[PDB]
Amino acid sequence: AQYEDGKQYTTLEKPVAGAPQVLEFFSFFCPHCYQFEEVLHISDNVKKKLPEGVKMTKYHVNFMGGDLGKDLTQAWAVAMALGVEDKVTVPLFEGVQKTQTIRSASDIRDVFINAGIKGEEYDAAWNSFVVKSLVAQQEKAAADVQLRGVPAMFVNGKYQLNPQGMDTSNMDVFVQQYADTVKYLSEK
Numbered sequence: 001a002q003y004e005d006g007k008q009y010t011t012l013e014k015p016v017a018g019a020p021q022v023l024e025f026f027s028f029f030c031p032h033c034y035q036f037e038e039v040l041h042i043s044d045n046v047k048k049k050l051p052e053g054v055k056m057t058k059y060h061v062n063f064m065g066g067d068l069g070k071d072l073t074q075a076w077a078v079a080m081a082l083g084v085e086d087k088v089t090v091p092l093f094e095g096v097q098k099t100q101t102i103r104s105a106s107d108i109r110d111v112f113i114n115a116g117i118k119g120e121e122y123d124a125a126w127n128s129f130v131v132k133s134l135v136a137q138q139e140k141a142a143a144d145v146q147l148r149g150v151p152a153m154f155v156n157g158k159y160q161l162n163p164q165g166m167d168t169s170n171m172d173v174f175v176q177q178y179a180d181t182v183k184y185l186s187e188k
């Protein structure tokens with residue numbers, strides 16, 4: 001067939017019950033995730049092609065970057081709680097991987113301050129149990145699928161995107177194939 005298990009996607013041998021519809025995982029340390037987000041814009045183009053009533057969830061992971069990697073998962077929780085993902089994603093990726101100016105939790109905080117989040121608001125969120133709950137949700141979701149590589153995208157806790165079965169001679173074609181596969185899987 002045109003889409004086949006083991007090709008554009010794989011099937012989870014143990015399907016995850018109650019999982020978000022479209023679940024993306026990434027790390028601000030992850031060089032391929034930088035490409036996916038800053039160059040290819042995977043999330044946006046997927047989000048874009050999604051059917052109506054299909055929600056998209058994106059979570060950070062801990063297993064890259066040690067202590068700072070864990071700080072970044074908490075900061076992504078702050079980003080989600082405040083609703084400022086579209087303001088901090090670019091400067092977080094560039095601070096970690098382009099300028100390499102992000103070396104501490106304080107450097108992370110600087111990115112939010114510069115993006116216009118007030119110091120008091122960041123700190124209250126950072127220290128909040130709402131954010132601790134959001135950290136826990138990110139860890140649980142990754143745990144549910146034995147997650148050990150990023151970038152990754154899962155559909156309905158059953159299917160895992162497989163970009164390795166896609167041509168990358170043209171970036172735009174790769175992206176739309178990826179997006180159309182997510183759409184196909186969400187309709188499945």
Ligand SMILES: CNCc1cccc(-c2cccs2)c1
Pocket residue numbers: 032035036039150151163164168171174
């Ligand atoms: C794990 N994902 C890696 C991957 C797979 C397919 C294509 C790419 C890229 C194409 C252009 C920049 S990056 C990266």
